[PDB]
């Protein structure tokens, strides 16, 4: 908890950055500067493939980075605005729960570990599919629901 | 003069392709939290070991 | 003419390997396409 | 059981279309155009060896799709006309439990997940063997009891 | 004129057989929920993945 930093544009908040493990992860589709000057001055490696900008955390002065796991069992996860249901290869939330500007928020398991980071979602009718960044034991991968839009 | 230009251009392109390949190959490891680059891969990509 | 007629085509000029190369090239494409279909049909047949 | 996915495709109904996973499914042997418009306009792929036609579910109605699994433990399964006994890898019902025109109906496990779709069956005394479409890991297969008739 | 016709006809048949094979070995993947087509097959049959 409280590992979330704001990413701001000149006239608005555009998204969030999260400290996960040894690296700070920010959605590549979000334009703005991190509120914390310590992270704002940090160089990031941009990858359009996974919609990510990542950089190493100054862990010598940033020891509050969250724990994370590659495991993705079926069940419910905590994504700040409520619970998110995970089944098969997709995360699903209530239709009125999602919104623009919320990208960058992590999804936590029942152990408080980060599982995935929200980029956006798709309106499937009664429910909204959640577009997230996830990882396996070796490398980062991305989940993209059909018709998903960046938030 | 032209032959020298073309040969040098070809080398510059070959290097550019190698750098592009290196970035694409390694990105998934440097972009991922908790990930460690395989020993053989770091030698191939001509990069520093792991995270240090 | 002291010789006979050319007759029915079969006795045409040599350096006609162009005919064999084109015929072979097309026949090969058919043979390969036929093999691909046969393999798929065999797999499809076994699956129920 | 407690959910209806069975969309009629004809004024004179002969079986139903249903939503399973991410695909729209109906028996290939039943004629008619699926109702509710959104499904009516879908193109379907037909396989005469499976007696099955499928099409992609539109994103906006994807949330209404039934849950799917390939797992089939021995035991009893649910459907809208009663219970189904699964024995020896085959689905069986009481004679008279199903009739012609009732095809296209999913068979559900105890978690509400679809394991098979009814095409027809064979009437053998007091019990009827079902001809169904079922799935294994990453493959579609069909079971056809001897003497089975199309429904 | 005849040789050209026959050779073109043979090619058209070879293509038709390839297209038949393309449908027959793929349709079962479309019928199966998740459309879990393996990477190598997608390259061979020139087809798109489940999330395309």
Short mmCIF file of C-alpha atoms in Angstrom, two decimals:
data_model
loop_
_atom_site.label_atom_id
_atom_site.label_comp_id
_atom_site.label_asym_id
_atom_site.label_seq_id
_atom_site.Cartn_x
_atom_site.Cartn_y
_atom_site.Cartn_z
CA UNK A 1 0.00 0.00 0.00
CA UNK A 2 0.96 3.67 -0.56
CA UNK A 3 3.46 2.77 -3.28
CA UNK A 4 1.61 4.80 -5.90
CA UNK A 5 2.89 8.08 -7.31
CA UNK A 6 1.03 10.60 -9.45
CA UNK A 7 2.00 11.34 -13.04
CA UNK A 8 1.02 14.88 -13.91
CA UNK A 9 0.61 16.97 -17.02
CA UNK A 10 0.82 20.75 -16.89
CA UNK A 11 -2.93 21.14 -16.36
CA UNK A 12 -4.06 17.69 -15.17
CA UNK A 13 -3.28 14.29 -13.64
CA UNK A 14 -2.81 11.74 -16.42
CA UNK A 15 -1.91 8.52 -14.59
CA UNK A 16 0.08 6.78 -11.87
CA UNK A 17 3.51 5.20 -11.42
CA UNK A 18 4.12 2.22 -9.13
CA UNK A 19 7.17 0.92 -7.29
CA UNK A 20 7.35 -2.83 -7.79
CA UNK A 21 10.31 -4.88 -6.61
CA UNK A 22 13.54 -3.35 -7.90
CA UNK A 23 11.93 -1.33 -10.70
CA UNK A 24 9.48 1.54 -11.09
CA UNK A 25 6.85 0.92 -13.74
CA UNK A 26 4.82 3.51 -15.63
CA UNK A 27 2.38 3.05 -18.57
CA UNK A 28 3.94 4.28 -21.81
CA UNK A 29 0.63 5.75 -22.95
CA UNK A 30 0.60 8.21 -20.05
CA UNK A 31 2.18 11.60 -20.66
CA UNK A 32 3.40 13.64 -17.72
CA UNK A 33 6.02 13.94 -14.98
CA UNK A 34 6.17 11.95 -11.75
CA UNK A 35 5.23 14.03 -8.69
CA UNK A 36 8.21 12.74 -6.73
CA UNK A 37 11.32 14.60 -7.91
CA UNK A 38 13.46 11.59 -7.01
CA UNK A 39 11.66 9.55 -9.65
CA UNK A 40 10.99 12.43 -12.05
CA UNK A 41 14.72 12.85 -12.67
CA UNK A 42 15.15 9.11 -13.17
CA UNK A 43 15.81 7.90 -16.71
CA UNK A 44 13.32 5.37 -18.09
CA UNK A 45 13.53 2.74 -20.82
CA UNK A 46 10.52 2.99 -23.11
CA UNK A 47 9.01 -0.06 -24.79
CA UNK A 48 6.01 0.31 -27.10
CA UNK A 49 5.63 -3.46 -27.22
CA UNK A 50 4.41 -3.73 -23.62
CA UNK A 51 3.22 -0.14 -23.21
CA UNK A 52 5.81 0.38 -20.46
CA UNK A 53 8.43 2.82 -19.28
CA UNK A 54 10.61 1.21 -16.61
CA UNK A 55 13.58 2.27 -14.51
CA UNK A 56 15.62 0.97 -11.59
CA UNK A 57 14.44 2.08 -8.15
CA UNK A 58 16.82 4.07 -5.90
CA UNK A 59 16.29 1.38 -3.27
CA UNK A 60 18.94 2.97 -1.06
CA UNK A 61 16.37 5.69 -0.37
CA UNK A 62 13.24 3.95 -1.68
CA UNK A 63 12.67 0.82 0.40
CA UNK A 64 8.89 1.08 0.18
CA UNK A 65 8.64 -0.76 -3.14
CA UNK A 66 5.89 -3.38 -3.12
CA UNK A 67 6.24 -7.16 -3.28
CA UNK A 68 5.12 -9.02 -6.40
CA UNK A 69 4.36 -12.46 -7.80
CA UNK A 70 4.09 -14.12 -11.20
CA UNK A 71 1.34 -16.44 -9.98
CA UNK A 72 -2.16 -15.97 -11.40
CA UNK A 73 -4.69 -18.38 -9.79
CA UNK A 74 -8.41 -17.92 -10.37
CA UNK A 75 -10.11 -15.71 -7.79
CA UNK A 76 -10.54 -12.08 -6.76
CA UNK A 77 -7.84 -9.42 -6.49
CA UNK A 78 -7.68 -5.94 -4.93
CA UNK A 79 -7.27 -3.15 -7.50
CA UNK A 80 -7.91 -0.14 -5.21
CA UNK A 81 -11.35 0.73 -6.58
CA UNK A 82 -12.77 -2.65 -5.63
CA UNK A 83 -12.29 -6.34 -6.29
CA UNK A 84 -11.38 -7.65 -9.74
CA UNK A 85 -12.42 -11.10 -10.87
CA UNK A 86 -9.82 -13.25 -12.58
CA UNK A 87 -10.77 -16.21 -14.75
CA UNK A 88 -9.03 -17.91 -17.63
CA UNK A 89 -6.59 -15.41 -19.12
CA UNK A 90 -8.54 -12.24 -18.31
CA UNK A 91 -9.28 -9.82 -15.47
CA UNK A 92 -12.83 -8.47 -15.20
CA UNK A 93 -14.32 -5.49 -13.30
CA UNK A 94 -17.77 -3.80 -12.90
CA UNK A 95 -18.58 -1.49 -15.80
CA UNK A 96 -18.85 1.66 -13.70
CA UNK A 97 -15.64 0.91 -11.81
CA UNK A 98 -13.20 1.74 -14.61
CA UNK A 99 -12.20 5.20 -15.82
CA UNK A 100 -9.62 7.24 -17.83
CA UNK A 101 -6.64 8.52 -15.85
CA UNK A 102 -6.61 5.44 -13.61
CA UNK A 103 -3.89 3.67 -15.58
CA UNK A 104 -0.78 2.64 -13.67
CA UNK A 105 -2.59 1.26 -10.63
CA UNK A 106 -1.44 -2.29 -9.64
CA UNK A 107 -3.60 -5.31 -8.88
CA UNK A 108 -2.83 -6.95 -5.52
CA UNK A 109 -3.38 -10.52 -4.37
CA UNK A 110 -4.49 -11.61 -0.90
CA UNK A 111 -0.87 -11.60 0.26
CA UNK A 112 -0.44 -7.93 -0.67
CA UNK A 113 1.70 -8.80 -3.70
CA UNK A 114 1.42 -7.06 -7.07
CA UNK A 115 0.18 -9.29 -9.87
CA UNK A 116 -0.53 -6.90 -12.73
CA UNK A 117 -0.74 -3.21 -13.69
CA UNK A 118 -3.85 -1.64 -15.25
CA UNK A 119 -3.55 0.02 -18.67
CA UNK A 120 -7.19 0.14 -19.75
CA UNK A 121 -10.18 -2.10 -20.50
CA UNK A 122 -13.08 -3.05 -22.80
CA UNK A 123 -16.84 -2.84 -22.33
CA UNK A 124 -18.23 -6.37 -22.65
CA UNK A 125 -21.77 -5.41 -21.65
CA UNK A 126 -22.54 -6.33 -18.04
CA UNK A 127 -18.82 -6.31 -17.25
CA UNK A 128 -15.64 -4.55 -18.36
CA UNK A 129 -12.55 -6.49 -19.42
CA UNK A 130 -9.40 -5.19 -17.81
CA UNK A 131 -6.26 -4.61 -19.90
CA UNK A 132 -3.18 -5.21 -17.79
CA UNK A 133 0.57 -5.70 -17.70
CA UNK A 134 1.57 -9.01 -16.17
CA UNK A 135 4.64 -11.18 -15.91
CA UNK A 136 5.80 -14.77 -15.87
CA UNK A 137 8.78 -16.18 -13.99
CA UNK A 138 11.18 -14.93 -16.69
CA UNK A 139 9.82 -11.94 -18.65
CA UNK A 140 7.01 -9.37 -18.71
CA UNK A 141 3.96 -10.04 -20.89
CA UNK A 142 0.78 -8.13 -21.71
CA UNK A 143 -2.92 -8.99 -21.75
CA UNK A 144 -5.04 -7.16 -24.32
CA UNK A 145 -8.84 -7.74 -24.33
CA UNK A 146 -10.52 -7.15 -27.68
CA UNK A 147 -11.71 -3.57 -28.12
CA UNK A 148 -9.75 -2.40 -25.08
CA UNK A 149 -8.92 1.29 -24.77
CA UNK A 150 -6.20 3.04 -22.78
CA UNK A 151 -7.32 4.73 -19.53
CA UNK B 1 34.84 7.80 -53.28
CA UNK B 2 31.49 6.17 -54.02
CA UNK B 3 32.68 2.65 -53.26
CA UNK B 4 34.07 3.83 -49.93
CA UNK B 5 30.81 5.57 -49.08
CA UNK B 6 28.70 2.53 -49.92
CA UNK B 7 30.88 0.10 -47.99
CA UNK B 8 30.89 2.37 -44.95
CA UNK B 9 27.13 2.82 -45.24
CA UNK B 10 26.62 -0.95 -45.33
CA UNK B 11 28.62 -1.33 -42.13
CA UNK B 12 26.68 1.45 -40.43
CA UNK B 13 23.45 -0.33 -41.36
CA UNK B 14 24.71 -3.69 -40.12
CA UNK B 15 25.59 -2.10 -36.80
CA UNK B 16 22.24 -0.33 -36.58
CA UNK B 17 20.45 -3.63 -37.19
CA UNK B 18 22.51 -5.30 -34.47
CA UNK B 19 21.69 -2.55 -31.98
CA UNK B 20 18.00 -2.80 -32.84
CA UNK B 21 18.10 -6.56 -32.43
CA UNK B 22 19.93 -6.20 -29.13
CA UNK B 23 17.34 -3.82 -27.71
CA UNK B 24 14.39 -5.95 -28.80
CA UNK B 25 15.95 -9.15 -27.48
CA UNK B 26 16.88 -7.77 -24.06
CA UNK B 27 13.93 -5.44 -23.42
CA UNK B 28 11.66 -8.21 -21.94
CA UNK B 29 14.31 -8.85 -19.28
CA UNK B 30 15.21 -5.26 -18.41
CA UNK B 31 11.56 -4.22 -18.54
CA UNK B 32 10.51 -6.95 -16.09
CA UNK B 33 10.69 -6.51 -12.26
CA UNK B 34 12.63 -9.22 -10.43
CA UNK B 35 14.00 -10.57 -13.71
CA UNK B 36 17.61 -11.65 -14.14
CA UNK B 37 19.38 -11.75 -17.49
CA UNK B 38 20.73 -15.24 -18.42
CA UNK B 39 24.52 -15.44 -18.45
CA UNK B 40 24.75 -16.42 -22.10
CA UNK B 41 22.33 -13.69 -23.13
CA UNK B 42 24.33 -10.96 -21.42
CA UNK B 43 27.41 -12.07 -23.35
CA UNK B 44 25.50 -12.07 -26.64
CA UNK B 45 23.85 -8.72 -25.99
CA UNK B 46 27.17 -7.26 -24.85
CA UNK B 47 25.65 -5.89 -21.64
CA UNK B 48 26.50 -5.80 -17.94
CA UNK B 49 25.60 -8.84 -15.83
CA UNK B 50 22.16 -8.88 -14.20
CA UNK B 51 21.26 -5.57 -12.56
CA UNK B 52 24.78 -4.31 -11.64
CA UNK C 1 12.24 -32.39 -100.29
CA UNK C 2 14.49 -35.43 -100.00
CA UNK C 3 13.32 -35.98 -96.43
CA UNK C 4 9.94 -36.77 -94.88
CA UNK C 5 7.57 -34.48 -93.01
CA UNK C 6 8.19 -33.31 -89.45
CA UNK C 7 5.11 -35.22 -88.29
CA UNK C 8 3.21 -34.93 -85.02
CA UNK C 9 4.86 -32.78 -82.37
CA UNK C 10 7.20 -34.97 -80.30
CA UNK C 11 10.23 -34.46 -82.51
CA UNK C 12 10.56 -30.74 -81.79
CA UNK C 13 13.87 -28.93 -81.35
CA UNK C 14 16.18 -29.75 -78.49
CA UNK C 15 16.96 -27.04 -76.00
CA UNK C 16 13.30 -27.55 -75.16
CA UNK C 17 14.23 -28.08 -71.54
CA UNK C 18 12.20 -24.93 -70.98
CA UNK C 19 9.13 -27.08 -71.55
CA UNK C 20 10.35 -29.70 -69.10
CA UNK C 21 11.34 -27.06 -66.54
CA UNK C 22 7.96 -25.35 -66.71
CA UNK C 23 6.05 -28.63 -66.76
CA UNK C 24 8.19 -29.96 -63.92
CA UNK C 25 7.83 -26.75 -61.92
CA UNK C 26 4.05 -26.89 -62.22
CA UNK C 27 3.93 -30.64 -61.63
CA UNK C 28 6.07 -30.18 -58.52
CA UNK C 29 3.73 -27.52 -57.14
CA UNK C 30 0.82 -29.90 -57.67
CA UNK C 31 2.70 -32.80 -56.10
CA UNK C 32 3.52 -30.71 -53.04
CA UNK C 33 0.02 -29.29 -52.70
CA UNK C 34 -1.36 -32.80 -53.04
CA UNK C 35 0.96 -34.04 -50.31
CA UNK C 36 -0.07 -31.25 -47.97
CA UNK C 37 -3.74 -32.07 -48.45
CA UNK C 38 -3.09 -35.79 -48.01
CA UNK C 39 -1.26 -35.23 -44.73
CA UNK C 40 -4.04 -33.00 -43.42
CA UNK C 41 -6.70 -35.49 -44.49
CA UNK C 42 -4.80 -38.28 -42.74
CA UNK C 43 -4.64 -36.29 -39.50
CA UNK C 44 -8.26 -35.21 -39.84
CA UNK C 45 -9.27 -38.82 -40.48
CA UNK C 46 -7.62 -40.11 -37.31
CA UNK C 47 -9.16 -37.35 -35.17
CA UNK C 48 -12.77 -37.89 -34.00
CA UNK D 1 -29.82 -24.42 -15.34
CA UNK D 2 -30.25 -20.91 -13.85
CA UNK D 3 -28.93 -19.17 -16.96
CA UNK D 4 -30.39 -18.86 -20.45
CA UNK D 5 -28.10 -18.62 -23.46
CA UNK D 6 -30.40 -20.58 -25.74
CA UNK D 7 -31.29 -18.19 -28.54
CA UNK D 8 -33.80 -19.42 -31.11
CA UNK D 9 -32.80 -19.24 -34.77
CA UNK D 10 -36.16 -19.95 -36.40
CA UNK D 11 -39.90 -19.24 -36.10
CA UNK D 12 -40.35 -22.99 -35.81
CA UNK D 13 -37.65 -23.79 -33.32
CA UNK D 14 -35.42 -26.79 -33.92
CA UNK D 15 -32.62 -26.49 -31.37
CA UNK D 16 -30.92 -23.38 -29.96
CA UNK D 17 -27.77 -21.30 -30.38
CA UNK D 18 -25.62 -20.60 -27.32
CA UNK D 19 -22.65 -18.60 -26.08
CA UNK D 20 -19.74 -20.72 -24.89
CA UNK D 21 -16.45 -19.08 -23.98
CA UNK D 22 -15.66 -16.59 -26.73
CA UNK D 23 -17.58 -18.38 -29.50
CA UNK D 24 -21.21 -18.56 -30.64
CA UNK D 25 -22.26 -22.16 -31.16
CA UNK D 26 -25.08 -24.02 -32.85
CA UNK D 27 -25.59 -27.50 -34.42
CA UNK D 28 -24.82 -27.55 -38.14
CA UNK D 29 -27.83 -29.75 -38.84
CA UNK D 30 -30.39 -27.16 -37.74
CA UNK D 31 -31.55 -24.43 -40.12
CA UNK D 32 -32.57 -20.85 -39.34
CA UNK D 33 -31.12 -17.42 -38.55
CA UNK D 34 -30.11 -16.63 -34.97
CA UNK D 35 -32.32 -14.03 -33.32
CA UNK D 36 -31.39 -10.79 -31.51
CA UNK D 37 -29.71 -9.29 -34.62
CA UNK D 38 -26.17 -9.13 -33.22
CA UNK D 39 -25.83 -12.88 -33.66
CA UNK D 40 -27.96 -12.94 -36.82
CA UNK D 41 -25.32 -11.10 -38.84
CA UNK D 42 -22.39 -13.27 -37.76
CA UNK D 43 -20.55 -15.41 -40.28
CA UNK D 44 -20.12 -19.03 -39.20
CA UNK D 45 -17.50 -21.66 -39.92
CA UNK D 46 -19.00 -25.08 -40.57
CA UNK D 47 -17.50 -28.51 -40.03
CA UNK D 48 -19.55 -31.42 -41.33
CA UNK D 49 -17.57 -33.92 -39.28
CA UNK D 50 -18.48 -32.20 -36.01
CA UNK D 51 -22.00 -31.12 -36.97
CA UNK D 52 -20.99 -27.77 -35.52
CA UNK D 53 -21.04 -24.15 -36.65
CA UNK D 54 -19.18 -21.41 -34.79
CA UNK D 55 -18.73 -17.63 -34.91
CA UNK D 56 -16.96 -15.00 -32.81
CA UNK D 57 -18.99 -13.44 -30.00
CA UNK D 58 -19.35 -9.62 -30.38
CA UNK D 59 -17.44 -7.78 -27.67
CA UNK D 60 -20.43 -5.89 -26.26
CA UNK D 61 -22.29 -9.12 -25.47
CA UNK D 62 -19.20 -11.09 -24.46
CA UNK D 63 -19.99 -10.69 -20.76
CA UNK D 64 -23.11 -12.81 -21.29
CA UNK D 65 -21.08 -15.80 -22.49
CA UNK D 66 -21.26 -19.04 -20.51
CA UNK D 67 -18.21 -20.29 -18.63
CA UNK D 68 -16.41 -23.19 -20.31
CA UNK D 69 -14.21 -26.11 -19.27
CA UNK D 70 -12.85 -29.23 -20.95
CA UNK D 71 -12.71 -31.12 -17.66
CA UNK D 72 -15.12 -34.04 -17.38
CA UNK D 73 -15.03 -36.07 -14.12
CA UNK D 74 -17.43 -39.00 -13.85
CA UNK D 75 -20.68 -37.98 -12.16
CA UNK D 76 -23.85 -35.98 -12.79
CA UNK D 77 -24.23 -32.85 -14.92
CA UNK D 78 -27.04 -30.30 -15.23
CA UNK D 79 -29.23 -29.18 -18.12
CA UNK D 80 -32.55 -27.40 -18.61
CA UNK D 81 -34.54 -30.61 -18.95
CA UNK D 82 -33.16 -32.47 -15.93
CA UNK D 83 -29.93 -34.15 -14.87
CA UNK D 84 -27.34 -35.92 -17.04
CA UNK D 85 -25.47 -39.02 -15.94
CA UNK D 86 -21.87 -39.09 -17.14
CA UNK D 87 -20.59 -42.66 -17.12
CA UNK D 88 -17.79 -44.34 -19.03
CA UNK D 89 -16.96 -41.05 -20.74
CA UNK D 90 -20.49 -40.86 -22.17
CA UNK D 91 -23.44 -38.61 -21.31
CA UNK D 92 -26.76 -40.39 -20.67
CA UNK D 93 -30.27 -39.21 -19.77
CA UNK D 94 -33.62 -40.91 -18.92
CA UNK D 95 -35.69 -41.71 -22.00
CA UNK D 96 -38.16 -38.91 -22.66
CA UNK D 97 -36.01 -36.39 -20.77
CA UNK D 98 -35.07 -34.84 -24.12
CA UNK D 99 -36.88 -34.54 -27.44
CA UNK D 100 -36.20 -33.39 -31.03
CA UNK D 101 -35.93 -29.61 -31.07
CA UNK D 102 -34.10 -29.55 -27.71
CA UNK D 103 -30.66 -29.73 -29.33
CA UNK D 104 -28.00 -27.04 -29.00
CA UNK D 105 -28.43 -26.99 -25.22
CA UNK D 106 -25.17 -26.94 -23.16
CA UNK D 107 -24.47 -29.47 -20.42
CA UNK D 108 -23.15 -27.83 -17.25
CA UNK D 109 -20.88 -29.03 -14.45
CA UNK D 110 -21.27 -28.22 -10.76
CA UNK D 111 -19.50 -24.89 -11.25
CA UNK D 112 -21.90 -23.83 -14.00
CA UNK D 113 -19.30 -24.44 -16.72
CA UNK D 114 -20.14 -25.96 -20.11
CA UNK D 115 -18.64 -29.34 -20.94
CA UNK D 116 -20.79 -30.47 -23.87
CA UNK D 117 -23.55 -29.48 -26.31
CA UNK D 118 -26.39 -31.84 -27.26
CA UNK D 119 -26.89 -32.73 -30.93
CA UNK D 120 -29.15 -35.76 -30.51
CA UNK D 121 -29.21 -39.21 -28.91
CA UNK D 122 -30.00 -42.94 -29.08
CA UNK D 123 -33.06 -44.36 -27.34
CA UNK D 124 -32.13 -47.66 -25.68
CA UNK D 125 -34.90 -48.83 -23.38
CA UNK D 126 -35.30 -46.62 -20.31
CA UNK D 127 -32.15 -44.62 -21.05
CA UNK D 128 -31.00 -42.43 -23.94
CA UNK D 129 -27.37 -41.99 -24.94
CA UNK D 130 -26.54 -38.45 -26.00
CA UNK D 131 -24.74 -37.41 -29.14
CA UNK D 132 -22.76 -34.38 -28.06
CA UNK D 133 -20.06 -31.91 -28.96
CA UNK D 134 -17.37 -31.86 -26.31
CA UNK D 135 -13.86 -30.56 -25.91
CA UNK D 136 -10.46 -31.82 -24.86
CA UNK D 137 -7.43 -29.67 -24.23
CA UNK D 138 -7.15 -27.36 -27.25
CA UNK D 139 -9.38 -29.52 -29.48
CA UNK D 140 -13.03 -30.12 -30.39
CA UNK D 141 -14.33 -33.69 -30.54
CA UNK D 142 -17.69 -35.40 -31.02
CA UNK D 143 -19.38 -38.42 -29.44
CA UNK D 144 -21.95 -40.33 -31.51
CA UNK D 145 -23.67 -43.37 -29.89
CA UNK D 146 -24.84 -46.02 -32.33
CA UNK D 147 -28.38 -45.49 -33.59
CA UNK D 148 -28.42 -41.89 -32.37
CA UNK D 149 -30.88 -39.58 -34.10
CA UNK D 150 -30.53 -35.85 -34.75
CA UNK D 151 -32.55 -33.48 -32.53
CA UNK E 1 -2.75 -21.96 -76.09
CA UNK E 2 -3.63 -25.43 -74.80
CA UNK E 3 -0.36 -25.95 -72.94
CA UNK E 4 -0.79 -22.59 -71.23
CA UNK E 5 -4.35 -23.46 -70.25
CA UNK E 6 -3.38 -26.84 -68.83
CA UNK E 7 -0.42 -25.50 -66.87
CA UNK E 8 -2.54 -22.70 -65.41
CA UNK E 9 -5.28 -25.19 -64.57
CA UNK E 10 -2.79 -27.39 -62.72
CA UNK E 11 -1.62 -24.42 -60.66
CA UNK E 12 -5.20 -23.45 -59.84
CA UNK E 13 -5.80 -27.00 -58.62
CA UNK E 14 -2.65 -26.95 -56.49
CA UNK E 15 -3.87 -23.73 -54.91
CA UNK E 16 -7.34 -25.16 -54.33
CA UNK E 17 -5.81 -28.19 -52.60
CA UNK E 18 -3.68 -25.92 -50.41
CA UNK E 19 -6.73 -23.87 -49.46
CA UNK E 20 -8.66 -27.03 -48.63
CA UNK E 21 -5.83 -28.18 -46.39
CA UNK E 22 -5.70 -24.72 -44.82
CA UNK E 23 -9.35 -24.87 -43.86
CA UNK E 24 -9.40 -28.51 -42.75
CA UNK E 25 -6.47 -28.26 -40.35
CA UNK E 26 -7.56 -24.92 -38.86
CA UNK E 27 -11.35 -25.03 -38.60
CA UNK E 28 -11.17 -27.26 -35.43
CA UNK E 29 -9.14 -24.51 -33.75
CA UNK E 30 -11.81 -21.93 -34.52
CA UNK E 31 -14.52 -24.28 -33.28
CA UNK E 32 -12.64 -24.84 -30.01
CA UNK E 33 -13.13 -22.05 -27.40
CA UNK E 34 -10.08 -19.83 -26.98
CA UNK E 35 -8.87 -20.37 -30.57
CA UNK E 36 -5.59 -21.59 -29.08
CA UNK E 37 -3.59 -21.84 -32.30
CA UNK E 38 0.15 -22.54 -31.73
CA UNK E 39 2.70 -20.03 -33.03
CA UNK E 40 4.29 -22.29 -35.63
CA UNK E 41 0.95 -23.25 -37.16
CA UNK E 42 -0.04 -19.60 -37.43
CA UNK E 43 3.04 -18.94 -39.55
CA UNK E 44 2.51 -22.01 -41.73
CA UNK E 45 -1.17 -21.51 -42.52
CA UNK E 46 -0.98 -17.72 -42.64
CA UNK E 47 -3.66 -17.29 -39.96
CA UNK E 48 -4.28 -14.94 -37.05
CA UNK E 49 -4.22 -15.67 -33.31
CA UNK E 50 -7.06 -15.69 -30.76
CA UNK E 51 -6.36 -12.12 -29.66
CA UNK E 52 -5.93 -10.68 -33.20
#
